């Protein structure tokens, strides 16, 4: 099916403490494959998945200089944006950047992304047309004019439609045995009376890849979203994910309730019962 590549940069200023911390991570789908840490010893782009380790020294040199580059850009940008917003010198602030691409089952380019944040909220973002920008406020409008004059959007689009997609496609082949596999959820159900009258039904899904999954409860065939405690999908720390959905029922009626599991690795959606 469809696949994605994503890079996430995070630069946090620490006034007095020294130089801004810079963290970079790369993902193919729900799989992290690279990493860079300003405070770490190596000062290199590091592998974080096995299939990226077949890339030679030139790759690692290029990625390390590109990611150190970006770190220094955020450095001066941190200063600039502090000035835009008239903020004190003794405050810590956060620039966050995200870009990447989507490809179809045929590996053909679907979408490009480029978005920046200041202090956890939108700053500036590339549009669907890969040509215009969207500024969140007035400070971002100043950045938007600089980027217009420097023709940054053309650079963005050139990357998103080229280097990004073809390296996405490379990774999917080279890491085929890991990236293109679908692990179906291992389901099971639990039960916890809360009183002699009422009891909890919890529907589990474990060991699934990728992260996208859907759990729904149905009393008598009608959907339930009025008791369903859904937890945020979580990593097991072995490349798979977990999720559960709980429902509270009047004791004696639990055979009316069915959990429905929709996942990509499932030929057809599962149904469970207590």
């Amino acid at each position: 099916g469809s696949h994605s590549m994503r890079y996430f940069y995070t630069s946090v200023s620490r006034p007095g403490r020294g130089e801004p911390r810079f963290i970079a991570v790369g993902y193919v789908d729900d799989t992290q494959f690279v990493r860079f840490d300003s405070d770490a010893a190596s000062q290199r782009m590091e592998p974080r998945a096995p299939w990226i380790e077949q890339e030679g020294p030139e790759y690692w040199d290029q990625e390390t200089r590109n990611v150190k580059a970006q770190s220094q850009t955020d450095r001066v940008d941190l200063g600039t944006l502090r000035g835009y917003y008239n903020q004190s010198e003794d405050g810590s602030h956060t620039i966050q950047i995200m870009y990447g691409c989507d490809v179809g089952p045929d590996g053909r380019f679907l979408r490009g992304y480029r978005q920046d944040a200041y202090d956890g909220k939108d700053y500036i973002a590339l549009n669907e047309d890969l040509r215009s920008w969207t500024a969140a406020d007035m400070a971002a409008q100043i950045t938007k004019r600089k980027w217009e004059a420097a023709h940054a959007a053309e650079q963005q689009r050139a990357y998103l439609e080229g280097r990004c997609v073809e390296w996405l496609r490379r990774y999917l082949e080279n890491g085929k045995e890991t990236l293109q596999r679908t692990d179906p959820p291992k389901t099971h159900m639990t039960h916890h009376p809360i009183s002699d009258h009422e009891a909890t039904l919890r529907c589990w899904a474990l060991g699934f890849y990728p992260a996208e999954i859907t759990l729904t409860w149905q009393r008598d065939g009608e959907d339930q979203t009025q008791d369903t405690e859904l937890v945020e999908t979580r990593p097991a720390g072995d490349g798979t994910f977990q999720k559960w959905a709980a429902v509270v029922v009047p004791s004696g009626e639990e055979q009316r309730y069915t959990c429905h599991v929709q996942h990509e690795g499932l030929p057809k959606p599962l149904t469970l019962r207590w």
Partner: peptide, 11 residues
């Protein structure tokens, strides 16, 4: 990653 040969992209 972007071959940021630029910073035709400072904010």
């Amino acid at each position: 990653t972007m071959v940021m040969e630029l910073i035709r992209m400072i904010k």
